[PDB]
Amino acid sequence: GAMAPSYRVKRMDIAKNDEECVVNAANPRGLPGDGVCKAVYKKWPESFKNSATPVGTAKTVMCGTYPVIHAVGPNFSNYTESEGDRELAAAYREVAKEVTRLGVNSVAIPLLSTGVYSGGKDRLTQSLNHLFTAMDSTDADVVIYCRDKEWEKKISEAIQMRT
Template sequence: MASIEYKSKKIETRRGDISHQPDLEAIVNAANAMLLPGSGVAGAIHSAAGNQLAEECRHLAPISPGQAVITSGYNLPNRYVIHTLGPVFGRDKPEAEILANCYKNSLTLCTQKKIRSIGFPAISTGVFGYPVEEAAQIAIRTIKETIDSNPIYPEHIVIVLFTAKDKEIHDLVLKKIF
């Protein structure tokens, strides 16, 4: 696990399943526009949360790339799920700005709800095809910029990576940016 302290915030990377993070108040779903269960992160979160999550999501969809909405966590160990729609690499433009907005808008919801801890997956790097290193740079730079402009919430930010290779890339970027 790579971990740093910055302006009284803890930012870390860890390897694991985003739907199994009991120490975090909120987790982020790399959602599809209709907020439906799918594969990857969305599938794992919906499966662990139960049918009530899909029912609540039905009333919030569709969302646009970069937008973030919040629901209850239901059967997850987390109080909240923040759903954000990342860009499809090579299709949704400007993709870097849209990806940054996923992180900014999710962190804004943390401030609004006074959420103290949040876990992010590597948004858009799965079936949406965003190159992992480029996505990591955007994610971590955006997290740093958001902390610089918002000194209150959240206090603990975790990037939860499913593969060892993705974690290794994020660890290097974390050390480089901070």
């Protein structure tokens, strides 16, 4: 575990993380995809061997010794707000199980279902709160990645509100 388990936020490409493993915002089919998924495919293509997994699950595939945790959030274009919310919570619970199983001391995580799976809505708070619910009981250092300046400020404020 980390000496003093913490949350941090960074505004940068998650493919350039400084953590011991990465969470991919994957599609259920293990395709190169778009956004975070495409950056992860370019950096760790070997990790897409048999990476297909259902919505609300996470599947880890090694790239060398570096673990890529493929976490499949719901596409809110297809799911109801209610069913989507349950699958988004479930994906993060499966990420916490994988991070714990791997024994890493740090993990790089994106906000699942906030990009092309958002159904055209702002889901910063919804996604972040499900991330906290899952990861609060883990002792890895969690570094949350984002691309927008206003998202960085809102994520940083949410972390500080708890400390």
